[PDB]
Structures are given as structure tokens and as C-alpha cells.
Amino acid sequence: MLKYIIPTIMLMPLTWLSKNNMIWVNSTAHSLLISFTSLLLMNQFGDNSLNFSLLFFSDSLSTPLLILTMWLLPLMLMASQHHLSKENLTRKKLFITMLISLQLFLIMTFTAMELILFYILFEATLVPTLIIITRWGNQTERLNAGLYFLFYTLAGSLPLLVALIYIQNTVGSLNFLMLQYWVQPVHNSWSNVFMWLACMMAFMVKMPLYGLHLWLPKAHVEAPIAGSMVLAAVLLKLGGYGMLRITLILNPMTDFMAYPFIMLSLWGMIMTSSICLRQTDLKSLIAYSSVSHMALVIVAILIQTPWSYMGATALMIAHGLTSSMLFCLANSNYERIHSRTMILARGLQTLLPLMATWWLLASLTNLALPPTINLIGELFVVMSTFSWSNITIILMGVNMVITALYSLYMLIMTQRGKYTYHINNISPSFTRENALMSLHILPLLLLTLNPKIILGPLY
């Protein structure tokens, strides 16, 4: 993985040694080159994972998440450089450095063989993410958003550390390849019940599980655009990736331990989808939309079927592009009217015809129109949970209806109707913004032609 670690590290001297007016050009250009080389990780085999060294490996689960991570860095750079234009040069370079350091931790997190190494990197992502929100958010309550985000995580992550160290003592190793062969069944006991919860609750908070989700809308409303993009697209999936890995060593106890979380997820997805129908902050609506989509991922992971794991992988990738695109669309309006209130600026299709098309496409993928990979992932989960219990189709189907309702409600409210009379600063869409939207949706739709590369190891 050094061919990705080192050039990512070199982005830092590139940014600091660039001419003052070239920092965005150079960092964007070279981060795109790193993203191109990331496609060499597609050398996956049917039986064995791609095991580079004693520290790093890449299977079909981590590879799509790696590609998404390195694709997202140039997009965040493009999305950030406008609202940071007045920032002084050193603080701009520090901002870009946080984004680069976030990529560094993320690609190492997704490729670590040993689970303590994954833990340290998994925890290290907190620092630049917290700094990005509290330093470069606009509003007063970004400070509280940082503390909620920080302490929700550490409330779950410290028990995980204790469990991980306990598991190594008992088993002798935390190398994930070793765990596949030395794994032993988890028998029933109160000790194993708390081992299970310690192994899982940290990832539940990240997803976030319904009932542990209130940090997320708080974080999004305060974060700058790049913060929301990485948070929605990658940082949530750290918990999804963590669960997909650690469930290996939790059988058969997951059989009955999953129930309360499945109930929270299955009911939570309806609750959060309904909440979206009444949200007045556009960013908060997209944040609640993520909670609803990630509830499906949690169910998929917990029921542990080949179909559910494939759906979970596709849903995680598909949501990452879709939700990141929606924050970018929401942010493009915000950079004109300086408000996140959804009802403030209406009828924008009359004023911004092509941005209306991007809104339309983002909404269509959000409601999982066939054959977008959004639907492929959702459909696979719906398929698998029906076998788990046929009654789940009722909650799955109802959630589909509500998702279509709030997705299109977003579109109708902001883009259709009459334009607000007094808002007279809706300038034409910039090339940067149109490129940013298209750099989300085009790869997302191209993945329809070859979905297999996002379906994960169970494919």
C-alpha cells in the first residue's frame, strides 16, 4: 500500500511548497492522479485476498472503499476552495493538510490486517475531522457539534479497545487472516454478551444506529462542505466496514444479539424517513436521509447472508456518492443565499436550469431508481431480509414509499413552484460547480454497467 501512502504524504509538501496562487490547482491535479492509480487495486482473485505485506491487505470489500476515498479528496478540494477564498494562505494550506491527513488515515484504516492497527487509524480519523468542523465551521454551535461527535465516538470506542486487547490475549493474534482460521464459536454467557457489545457499539455509533444518531445531524449542520462530504461518504462507512469484519468472530452469538439492533434499524429507517418530510434545514434533511439508508446497511450486516453482504457493500458505495452530491447541491444554493432553510429559495429551475438537472439525478438515485447501484444495493438487502422474515417486506416497502416522497419533496420545494421575489443574487452556475456535480453522478451511473466491482467479497 506504500504506492498509495507515500504519494498521499507527498501531497503535503506539494501544497506547502506551491506558489501561493497554485495551491488548489496543484493539490487537485495530483490528488486526481493518485485516484487514477487506485484502480490498480482491482486485481482481486476469486479465492484469496490481495495481501501485500504483514501490515496491509486489500480484498473486494476494502478496494471500492479505497477508490471512493481517493476519489473524494479532489472533489472536496474543488468544493472547498470558494468559501475559503478569503482565508489567509497559511490557513488554506493547513485546511488542505487536514484533508490530506484524513485520506492518509482512511486508506490505512481500510487496508490494515491487524485489528489494533485498524483501531488506531480508525480513531486517528477523529482528529482532522474534529479540527475541520470546529475550526472551519461558520456557526457558534460547531463547538458543541465537535464535542458530541468526539464523545459519542469515544463512549463506544474505548470498550472496543478493551475487547480487542482481550481477544488477542485469548486467541493470540488480531491479524484478520489469522482470525479467519483460528476463529472459535462464541458461547452464551454474560461475559460474551458484553464482549459482543464492546465489539459492536463503536461501529453502531458511527453508522449511526437509530437511537445513537443525533450527533450526525448536529455535525452536518455545523460542518463546512468538505467536512460533510467526507463524513457522509466515508466516515460513516468506517463503522459499516468495521462491523463487516468483526462479525466474523461473533458467531453464533450474533443470532440473538442482533435482534434489538435490527428492531432499532427496521423501525428507525421508517422514523428517520418520516422525519425528512418535516425537516426545514436542507443539510439536516440530508443528514436524516443518511440515517435511514444506513439502517438498511446495519440490518444487512447483522443478518449475515451472502446476498445481504453484497447489498451492504453496494449500498455503502452508492450512498457515499449520492449523499455527497446532495450536500454539494445544497451547498451551491447556500453559497448564493447564505441560508440552509429549504423553503427560503424556491423555483430555482426557472433560474438555474442545468443545476435543476443535477438535483433531479441526485434525487432519482436517492430514491433508488432501477438500475442505479442505489437500487441494486437496496434490492439485495430487501431480498435477503425477506428470507430472514417475510414480514420485513412491509417495513421495507413502506420505507421505499416515504423515501420517494421526501426525495421528490426536496426537489419540488427547492426547484419548482415560483421563485422567491426578493432573492435577486442567484447568479448563473459556475463551471466549477457543474463539474463537481458531474464528477459525482457520472461515475455513480457508470457503475450500473459493471456493478460486480462494488458487490464485495461475497460476489
Add this chain to the structure above:
Amino acid sequence: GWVRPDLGDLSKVTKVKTDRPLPENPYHSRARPEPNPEVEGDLKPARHGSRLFFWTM
């Protein structure tokens, strides 16, 4: 015929021939506990290094 010993004479250490056998265990000591086995051999590098969690050295 008695001659008074000179200054320093009576503080001399002398030697006596005794047929009394030298005592073997005047302290009545028990057998001493056996020492811990002596650790020996050639020092080699640690097998795969420190082996601390993920470290490879």
C-alpha cells in the same frame, strides 16, 4: 622461674594442637535451597522482533 611476659605478648594470636575433631556443622544449618536453573546459551535476535501488536520489528 617465672618470667613476666613482655608488652604485646599476651595479645598474640597463638595455635593449639587439639585432638578434638573440628565440628562439621556448628551452626546446625539445614540444607540450602537449590539455586534457580542457570540460564545459558547463545543470545539470538527476538523471533519476529518485539511482536507487540501490529509491529513487524
